[PDB]
Symmetry: C3
Subunit: 281 residues, 3 copies
């Protein structure tokens, strides 16, 4: 199934009938960082499998819902269970849920992930406002837009120089200052590693030479589809570990350690993003 | 359809019956740089869709013809509308038209493109004679030769160290000197970005560290297929913008700006390549 | 055919019936470096085509056998004819023979290849003990583990920091010292170029900046599948040429030159690996 105009419209039709909500904000939350979704007010939970033309996710398993409702007086739609390209999803499967968000009325997309720190100023538990990216799959002919262009959504050759909105980064920092946790908040460039193996010690050393600040396995595909169709983006990484230090000390990273950092910071991240949503222009 | 000996021979059979021309020069022109094709003498225009085993190009649309005839007393074949890998064409679809050129008698292939400048000496409107390349898709398991080797055309493991003929670069520079536009003519290394998103500001900064002089989304696939089967190559980039300056000044690039630079330099490029064809040993 | 538990078990069932050998060591030998396989004692040769669920290899052709028997008192299984991803094999086709090795009882995998030297200390004929890697296909969304995870074999997100066993590297060096050829033995980081074109002169210059010591077109896919399912690895590169010197002197590399270096060092490599097998804890 192609992520074209007609197919995205059929999905949006279904969601409009079932939910009644006209959202103008979208959210995609990282692993263990979804508690906010469970506090959406007057909410409607829609399993992906029930939505016409949504990608099939039963081989990977685990939760996969679209959730609609209100936060801080604002109307939102959330993906509960994001799709990752290391599972083998095609470009068309990744793009269709974002293009459905567009047809529902979304103008701002908020994204979180966990990632490895490369910059030596970054420690476990820090937050990074993403200001740019290095897309290794894109350079290497696996860009999420490889394929025919869907002209109704955007141009054949997008410019990504303003993909990460500057004013949204400033608002996120202002709220951190108001609550006295700005000592945790950095900015930086996100490198996309297709995955699912963590960056090796020698890959980490290479990434430091190349000017990467953080590295992870998500986010860049969704950002590019959102930028293509004119949706503004704020993206924030929660640092699980510093991979350069770990290489010097022969320390390993694993998913259990990642989820423990998520649980340690989840409630503060929930509070932060609730206020961002409330304050959005 | 595989780009093998039998399939390429069937296409060449058709072209020989229809055209009568035995070319020994091939040309592939970049976007907005095709005016020379319209001045080919005693010419024959063959739509791709009419040629047995040629790749289907109707999803992308736009012009797609093979054109045969004479320039400067020399017999040539031109691709009018090149195939780009960001459209989703397979390795086999890209390679078959070049291998048909080989079976028709082509010994020299001339290529132009538009590209972004990375080297700080490059400005909008400059020309770069390509002397080498950095193939990010190839390093990342998307080389145009991934697949079974077609032994009749060339070896399993090609060496690309002489892919860009030195004497053809010297002839192109000599002609620029004769017409007093050598101040526009540089040499450099071409980085292949699969695309279709332009290099981001942070990707551009990385490319400068890596020794790239220019970056674009074409040319390297055709060069590798030509080198594999023993065809000599001259490739020239027309610089649309300097992406490093643009990153420092928050300036964007778009296809309208690219085509305006093409129109500004098209007639000089036409004059240049006509004389190169005329002078080829 | 997926490289899952049930399919690998069906292949292992067949091999157990035919061979009688319960191996705990696996070997994969590089081009021209397979003489040891022909001296396996009380051996059984099994063509891939006869084994249920093994990948089809007839398009590429050439030898493809599984060989089981005894070396130095130890029970081994060898792949005679390795699978290379530049042939177009899928992730599932590469992984299934390694996962069959696991089900047969393999705990240690020994690997050789030929490769190009990047570090200026490396000459034709030197050996490099691999201590880490830089996986350009993995960064670029062509990792051998892209797809659903096969949970019975290993975790969704593997850590590769101990993929190359330190004690096996120490044993290999000790044996070289015992036989007075330690002057040939280096250690280093292996870059994976998907291939099948050799690194270009300008790609070689880039690899030196990035901290790569050697570059080749194999090994990293098998290492990652072995590490995923808990098999220890020793991997050794035989240097065919120094690609940085060759770029400075406009010297080419080709497969004939590669095979001549293999023949020059084959007997010493056979002696070395026989003793390693004999001495394995
Ligand atoms: C969640 C995720 O993708 C991730 C987390 C930690 C890390 N060092 C690298 C990663 O890619
Ligand atoms: C024509 C083309 O591919 C191209 C043009 C300008 C640029 N900065 C990058 C590009 O890739
Ligand atoms: C056997 C092989 O893959 C190989 C050999 C020599 C070389 N300079 C590069 C290579 O990739």
């Amino acid at each position: 199934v192609v992520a074209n105009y007609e197919n995205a419209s059929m999905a949006a039709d279904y969601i409009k009938r079932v939910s009644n909500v006209l959202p103008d904000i979208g959210i995609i939350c990282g692993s263990g960082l979804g508690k906010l979704i469970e506090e959406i007010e007057e909410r409607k939970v829609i399993p992906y499998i029930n939505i016409p033309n949504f990608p099939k996710t039963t081989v990977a398993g685990h939760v996969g819902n679209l959730v609609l409702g209100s936060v801080g007086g604002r109307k939102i739609v959330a993906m509960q269970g994001r799709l990752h390209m290391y599972e083998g999803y095609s470009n068309q499967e990744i793009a269709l849920p974002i293009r459905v968000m567009k047809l529902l009325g979304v103008r701002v997309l908020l994204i979180t992930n966990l990632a490895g720190g490369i910059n030596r100023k970054l420690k476990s538990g820090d937050f990074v406002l993403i200001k740019g990216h290095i897309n290794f799959p894109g350079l290497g002919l696996n860009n999420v837009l490889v394929g025919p262009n869907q002209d109704e959504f955007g141009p054949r050759f997008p410019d990504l120089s303003n993909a990460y909105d500057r004013l949204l980064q400033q608002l996120a920092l202002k709220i951190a200052q108001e609550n006295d946790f700005q000592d945790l908040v950095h900015e930086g460039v996100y490198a996309f590693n297709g995955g699912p193996t963590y960056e090796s010690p020698d890959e980490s050393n290479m990434l430091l030479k190349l000017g990467c600040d953080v590295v992870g396995m998500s986010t860049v595909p969704e950002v590019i589809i959102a930028c293509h169709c004119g949706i503004k983006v704020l993206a924030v990484s929660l640092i699980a570990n510093n991979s350069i230090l770990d290489a010097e000390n022969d320390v390993s990273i694993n998913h259990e350690k990642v989820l423990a950092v998520a649980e340690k910071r989840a409630d503060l991240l929930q509070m932060w993003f609730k206020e961002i949503i409330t304050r959005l222009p």
